[PDB]
Amino acid sequence: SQVFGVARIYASFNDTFVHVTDLSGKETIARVTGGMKVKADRDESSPYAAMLAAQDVAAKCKEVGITAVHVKIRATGGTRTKTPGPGGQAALRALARSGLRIGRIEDVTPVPSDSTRKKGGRRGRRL
């Protein structure tokens, strides 16, 4: 009821991304989430780190000012596990709690019509 934008959340495995932008698409945000406050190189996806960096995300969001925004979350997907990452939900929650208004949501995880064969061969990763 006050203002709108875009969330653009993305949670990979061993990294995660979050960045707002105008609902017109090209626009901008500040966008630095993944290995920004956490630098151990394996805690990149970690939820304790997703919030630590998502915090500074809402900061700039409100620094220039956006009260409400809807989400568009996306997993690495495409051709590798089509599923949310650890720091995906652990970030917008720390931000919805940051005094942010949300609403209509849907994910944009890319899924194909069974093509572009994956890595690892027919025997896959062996361990």
Add this chain to the structure above:
Amino acid sequence: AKRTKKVGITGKYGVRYGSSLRRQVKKLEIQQHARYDCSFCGKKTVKRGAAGIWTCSCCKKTVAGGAYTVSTAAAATVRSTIRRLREMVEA
């Protein structure tokens, strides 16, 4: 009786130049010598000479074509896409 098991028309070259070179030649050789079917009269009377020139014995027409076959794969595919791009400029 069958005269040659494999050489066919390439037997003129005898034993020289290697089986591979001779074999591949026979391929284009067969094509450039055979009689094709004429598109303007319906009779198979169009033969080559002066590669890229295919003329019908009767009806006297001369068609430009591949060096060894009347229609080359590329030209045939072009005919298709030219029809496509053309059907696209009246309707």
Add this chain to the structure above:
Amino acid sequence: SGRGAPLAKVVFRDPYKYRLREEIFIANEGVHTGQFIYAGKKASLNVGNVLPLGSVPEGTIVSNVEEKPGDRGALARASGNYVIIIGHNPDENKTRVRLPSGAKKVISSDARGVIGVIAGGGRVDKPLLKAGRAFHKYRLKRNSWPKTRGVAMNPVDHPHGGGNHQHIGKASTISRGAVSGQKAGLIAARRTGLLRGSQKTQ
């Protein structure tokens, strides 16, 4: 004689005099005797006709394309060669196309081309099989055959000349800035060795 692709003699009326003028075109694959050819901007898109690159849509196939509007044919003239129109910039009225070499040059839309591909394609697929056929081939082009390997000559005859064994003796790649007399071998070669890979520019 001396050309792989066949020629096409096309007769036209002289719009300024009661007289016939006979142009000599390169026969595109499919053209036939007694065919009707159309030439101009407001012409149809039929294989054989000649239209400016602007008047044709993307993906068209043309040969004997003009580098500049009105040079009577400069590109895609060898047996079975063609160029493809891959775009138009109606402002500056340019038209970007792909040549047989793969290079993508942009030229004026008023430049002309003939719909289709050149005839006599696939001539190079048949081996020559004997020096005689190569001999007769060049008997009509020029005195460029046969070729003596510079490594079989004495030093007085070539850089690669001389030696108690047949060898080049120094790098076969030669600088572009080289001088006439030393530019023999791989000139300005940016690479060398057997090409193993994609072999098609993106």
Add this chain to the structure above:
Amino acid sequence: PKKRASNGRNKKGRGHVKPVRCVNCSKSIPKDKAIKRMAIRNIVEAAAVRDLSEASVYPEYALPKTYNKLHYCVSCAIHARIVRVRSREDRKNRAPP
């Protein structure tokens, strides 16, 4: 000898079934033999849904979730997901539970 009458899973009278590849290791596995689990997990958590709704527009309009079908490779399936190796006669029970 055999230790299952299907010797795979769900395939009698077809010869060949297009193969799917495991979500965990990408290894190929025939669709008829791939253990399938549809993961319908919400955007929710224990204490994350209340913060989500109070300080927001749209006072709990839809609340949608994640929907995607997963296919595993028996080797991977046995490692983490539902394999739960059974007993000689307890395995013939196809009751999902």
Add this chain to the structure above:
Amino acid sequence: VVDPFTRKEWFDIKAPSTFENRNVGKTLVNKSTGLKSASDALKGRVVEVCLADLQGSEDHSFRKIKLRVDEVQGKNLLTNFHGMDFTTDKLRSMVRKWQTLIEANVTVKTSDDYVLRIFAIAFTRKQANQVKRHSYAQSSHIRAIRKVISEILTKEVQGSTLAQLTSKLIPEVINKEIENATKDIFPLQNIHVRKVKLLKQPKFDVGALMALHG
């Protein structure tokens, strides 16, 4: 500090005549100085607004919409139609095992020359007294249905303009305008108009876009 907070201007947008309310909100684009300025490089975007977001009760919440910005003047930024789509939640919830899916599409034009490919989605309905958990159709049915869907589909489009086209699918009765035909062939739960996507349009025609304001 570069401080791109006081950086540029915010522009406004609304929606065409079709809907009840039209306030889109605002966006941020760039300084309007002419070196390479606004407008000439501005109206080439689109936004993702839900339908109930600008129409009303969410009895139309599934449908997502794209609005192609076309022309702008001093703080005007009005955007015409660009397409639509369903949402993962709805579609992924409609694809239930133990039933057969049906998808079909057609490419037509309206009068407002635009050639469009639409999409439709339908499933199988279990009869009230049914006892089989499979609830499946038969190829003869599925092919026949597609035909009537295709036939019906290219009636509204090429039957009116883009405006009435948008005004035709928002009531969604075409969804069951299929059902009267399918009621004689198969139950068919969840019959919809799931997606639409386009290619081009005649040149801008500045005068026609102004017939969506008031």
Add this chain to the structure above:
Amino acid sequence: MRAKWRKKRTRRLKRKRRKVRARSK
């Protein structure tokens, strides 16, 4: 050794032996 590897070892072995007497062909 593995079954299919014994095959490969044998296939190689015959290829080598095959070559060896073609020298005396």
Add this chain to the structure above:
Amino acid sequence: SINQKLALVIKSGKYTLGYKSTVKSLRQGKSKLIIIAANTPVLRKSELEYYAMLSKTKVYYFQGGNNELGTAVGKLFRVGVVSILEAGDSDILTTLA
């Protein structure tokens, strides 16, 4: 198809094959329909069409060269034009053609 409706005229009615016989038919008016192969030249086409209009005879352009028209009329040779004089029971003189 129409090859069917036409194939009944050879076994039932009267016809004439060939460019020359077909024109004497068009001059005497006995022709009610003439079939012209696809590959036949345009000059002869317009000529036959002229004679047809003079004999008020209808024409049908057979999609397929004279080779196809010949094997269609049951003959083993190219047929550039056919002129029907009596369609014994074929609806060819009454169908959409």
Add this chain to the structure above:
RNA sequence: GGUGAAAUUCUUGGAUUUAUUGAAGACUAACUACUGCGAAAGCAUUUGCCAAGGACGUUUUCAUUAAUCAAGAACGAAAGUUAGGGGAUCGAAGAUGAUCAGAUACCGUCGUAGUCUUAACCAUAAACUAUGCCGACUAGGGAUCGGGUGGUGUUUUUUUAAUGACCCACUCGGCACCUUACGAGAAAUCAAAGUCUUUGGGUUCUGGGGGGAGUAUGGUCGCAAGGCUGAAACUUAAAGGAAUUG
């Protein structure tokens, strides 16, 4: 970025992210099942065309025209070979980064051939149901696919039928499952793997302790890689199967 963790790697070239957007080749997700089809290989977006096929239905026709089959032939996954095209993807090779005592690997990176398509080959897969085909007989059970029959069964309501979908009962042919054991089996198990010392419906094929060895040799097929046919000398007391206990 990638992983268990890292590193080779990529980033004044604004990378990863976003936006509009185009190209290329590949694939058909979800729907998808103890579901369908084909001789097997094998077959999943649309539509048009091309011929083709089983089950059913049948008071139609022919009337033993058949069953099974050495020789011979049609097709035959994958990879692989020849000539074009294609070459997006993933990716033998190779080269790398990491690991390890070592690490030619597994994990990561690059990436050739390949992957795809046309024309021609090659003819092998745990090509599996590790289970010949035709015929008959023997046993209980509820699902399901296709055809069919039966109705003062429900729904569509239009105004009720006609229909269509659904319900029920039956019958023929399908893919299977379940419970039984008369019965079989060395057992695991099997409606055939049963109707066998109470041994005979028709017919095809193969096997005769383990190695040696699918080796040698001849023949033949193939461009090759290889396919098919296929020994012996010698050596050896076990090798093997299913089940039981540890």
